[PDB]
Amino acid sequence: RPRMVDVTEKPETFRTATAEAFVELTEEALSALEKGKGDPLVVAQLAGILAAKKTADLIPLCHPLPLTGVEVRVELLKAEKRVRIEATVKTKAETGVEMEAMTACAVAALTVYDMLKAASKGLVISQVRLLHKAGGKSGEWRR
Amino acid sequence: RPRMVDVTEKPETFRTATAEAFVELTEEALSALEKGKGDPLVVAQLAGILAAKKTADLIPLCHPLPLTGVEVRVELLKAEKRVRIEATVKTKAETGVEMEAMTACAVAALTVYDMLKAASKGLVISQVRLLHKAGGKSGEWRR
Amino acid sequence: RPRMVDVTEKPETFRTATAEAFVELTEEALSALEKGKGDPLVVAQLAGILAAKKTADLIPLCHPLPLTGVEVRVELLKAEKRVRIEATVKTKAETGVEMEAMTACAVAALTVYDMLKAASKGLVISQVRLLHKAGGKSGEWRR
Amino acid sequence: RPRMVDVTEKPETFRTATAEAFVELTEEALSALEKGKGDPLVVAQLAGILAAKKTADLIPLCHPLPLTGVEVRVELLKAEKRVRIEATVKTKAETGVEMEAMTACAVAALTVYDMLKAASKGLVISQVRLLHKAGGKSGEWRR
Amino acid sequence: RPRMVDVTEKPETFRTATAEAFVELTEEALSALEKGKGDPLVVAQLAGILAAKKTADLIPLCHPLPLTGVEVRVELLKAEKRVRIEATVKTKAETGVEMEAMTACAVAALTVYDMLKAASKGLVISQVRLLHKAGGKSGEWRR
Amino acid sequence: RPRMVDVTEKPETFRTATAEAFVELTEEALSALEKGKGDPLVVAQLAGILAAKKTADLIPLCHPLPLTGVEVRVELLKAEKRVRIEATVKTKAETGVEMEAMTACAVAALTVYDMLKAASKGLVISQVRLLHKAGGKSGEWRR
DSSP: OOOBOOOTTSOOEEEEEEEEEEEEOOHHHHHHHHHOOOOHHHHHHHHHHHHHHHHHHHSTTOOOOOOSEEEEEEEEETTTTEEEEEEEEEEEESSOOHHHHHHHHHHHHHHHHHHHTTTOTTOEEEEEEEEEEEOSTTOOEEO | OOOBOOOTTSOOEEEEEEEEEEEEOOHHHHHHHHHOOOOHHHHHHHHHHHHHHHHHHHSTTOOOOOOSEEEEEEEEETTTTEEEEEEEEEEEESSOOHHHHHHHHHHHHHHHHHHHTTTOTTOEEEEEEEEEEEOSTTOOEEO | OOOBOOOTTSOOEEEEEEEEEEEEOOHHHHHHHHHOOOOHHHHHHHHHHHHHHHHHHHSTTOOOOOOSEEEEEEEEETTTTEEEEEEEEEEEESSOOHHHHHHHHHHHHHHHHHHHTTTOTTOEEEEEEEEEEEOSTTOOEEO | OOOBOOOTTSOOEEEEEEEEEEEEOOHHHHHHHHHOOOOHHHHHHHHHHHHHHHHHHHSTTOOOOOOSEEEEEEEEETTTTEEEEEEEEEEEESSOOHHHHHHHHHHHHHHHHHHHTTTOTTOEEEEEEEEEEEOSTTOOEEO | OOOBOOOTTSOOEEEEEEEEEEEEOOHHHHHHHHHOOOOHHHHHHHHHHHHHHHHHHHSTTOOOOOOSEEEEEEEEETTTTEEEEEEEEEEEESSOOHHHHHHHHHHHHHHHHHHHTTTOTTOEEEEEEEEEEEOSTTOOEEO | OOOBOOOTTSOOEEEEEEEEEEEEOOHHHHHHHHHOOOOHHHHHHHHHHHHHHHHHHHSTTOOOOOOSEEEEEEEEETTTTEEEEEEEEEEEESSOOHHHHHHHHHHHHHHHHHHHTTTOTTOEEEEEEEEEEEOSTTOOEEO
16 A cells, blocks of 8 residues: 655665756747746746645655755757756755655746746647656666 | 736636646566556556646646546556556636646656656656647637 | 546535534543643634635545635533534535535644643544535535 | 744654544445445545645644654455544654644545545544554653 | 634625735845845745735635736835835635735745845835725725 | 755754734724734734744745744734734754744734734734844844
8 A cells, every 4th residue: 555655764864866857849939938927937947946845745655854955947948949947956864855856847847838838738848857866775876 | 027817807617628648667667567655556646636736836827726627547558668647627717727737647747756766766757748628718729 | 536526517506514523531631621832722723714724635536615604613511521623614616515614623623632632642533523514416414 | 822832952753653543334335435436445545644744734733844654544344334544653853743643544534534425424533543652751652 | 713704695706905015125135136046026026926825824714715816016126225015916706805915915025035134134024014905895995 | 046055064953033023003903902703813823833834835945844843922012002923933954944933923913914904904014023043154143
């Protein structure tokens, strides 16, 4: 059955996780983003930070923990016609923060979509994936 | 500047939105999902419904509204080696529920990832996209 | 599979629900309540109102809706050595508010327990049950 | 006046708490549960875990803390015609997690009720009580 | 005793509310704001919109309702050495949205303080007051 | 760009913060408060404690952390015709709790306003300011 894995007996260690996500743009959406309801990139960046803090409330079996660092970047890559979101979360705990990084990116992407769907309902959040993490038994991991 | 668009003077109408998302599986993850911390597909399905209701709290400029229907499906597509998530949300309001459908799919996908990252940290949430919506000025829309 | 039942096509009607709960007291707990960390009955009464509003966030398949009325009463029944909690919730919607009434009572009871567990950890929340409801196809119902 | 008791100067220690709750079934409800809106027992089990994490938000004077473990079990006891819910929560803190265990059980019970009230509005959540706890000055306690 | 006033029998009407708040700046804080952890005015503006939506969760007896419009402005008034926050909220309901407007301003002000307290811990949120409201029995009201 | 400042490498230390806020009363409001929808001072006091715990969810870049102590006082100062709110929050962390103290006072003030706006919509929350804090590099600070 589902359960929040017991990690009470594990030491408190430095954890970090970095993830990224992309939103593929149409020419219509790109134009809009270049013109600036508000700036999609700015609002999305903040939504990502807020989302990182709300992660345990969204992911059922996720361990609630105090975050000591959250960085989110939402950039427009004109030539590639897409928005790149990257998030790095840190803490000191018995479990990792991969979910916090992944959720920050996903919600920032959803926010970019929210800000541009008026003219482009077909915009796709192409990928959401982990790039790196450190801490824990498994140790350092890189894509 | 950012703002929650005023729709106070628009009539209250029947709205619907359907979105989908995918999680690409490695052979390791597929095996695990076939064996059943809990069943990833079951937990994710519920997380999606819960997420739909929490949408306005996650998307900054999203209009808060009472939902009258939420359907989420999380299925394993063995041959394609991936999990397909689909969500349909309904309501009667002055704005659409595309964000609720998109967020339900994104969070369900994040939950599948949470349940399988132990052995496969590189799993990717490949896409999150709108499939259909009805209601509003623009009328019916299909991918 | 689990789902938030579609009620989009049902008319918006006047709904009401009343529930109750009890906390059985030991002589130690009764004495404390008579002496007044704060007054358990006062804090619990407010927690119940707050809980009614948070119901859809706690009950997975519960329909989110705006409440138009919430009444909670937390009384000490000395001779019976127990605290009686009663809650009545109202709204205009396509679904009932039995869950809101039940949850308000349950959380108020949990709060009374929180305020008195220091000296009496064995206190029991004896019952939580629906007393009445009106509105909907089934019509009026009474215990 | 009400207050969140100051425990800043107390050491951080291993805490655990176990509680249980029951839902008394009618023959109608029992039949339904045996046939499986979704499986009441499965949805309730998850709601309990989620509820444990939301405890401090529901109980006014409750201390917010990171949980390191949450286990919830929702079982059908056919002969006894009732559902038994049990929850064990763990953490390392200056205060106990009795409220987290009690709330997990109460919300799981409320969810079972939500899933079966359609046909049986009179179902009763008979009891919610603490079974065990460890850690803190008072030490180990058992019902 | 406390209670969420019953307004179930009142018609659903157009409501609006406008409030404002100020943050008095020291020369140190003013300099910082002119140089731009992020832009205090931008982050605060978004926090205000988010806060408006979370109002019923923060104010105990406040009626939960769907908002149809939220506008927040956070401006620097150099000569006056202070930040002026203004918020207008709208909806269609049985109760007003004065609390939503007031809370949006208060939280935006708290956010400006958060972004500038590093160098100026003594900054004061001088006032938070209602400027206008319409709808309801009392009708239109202006400061 | 906005970011939750990284404090992962800072030691965990004892932090404390005290803030205050005022609500200026009209003779109408004063009379009401002396007569006792519920007692504004009692409801506001609890809202303040609850608000302290919800601070990180309201202030975008605020670090989420477990609080070990929360004290809130809401008093009527008849001669001065105003309500004085004071809040002290404590914890052990890498960052301070000034925001928790400030937010507790602001929300308690907003609640007093909510409870008295029926007859006095023009009531003003005159000030919200930090009175003291300890812990951190900067050390002890007093107004």
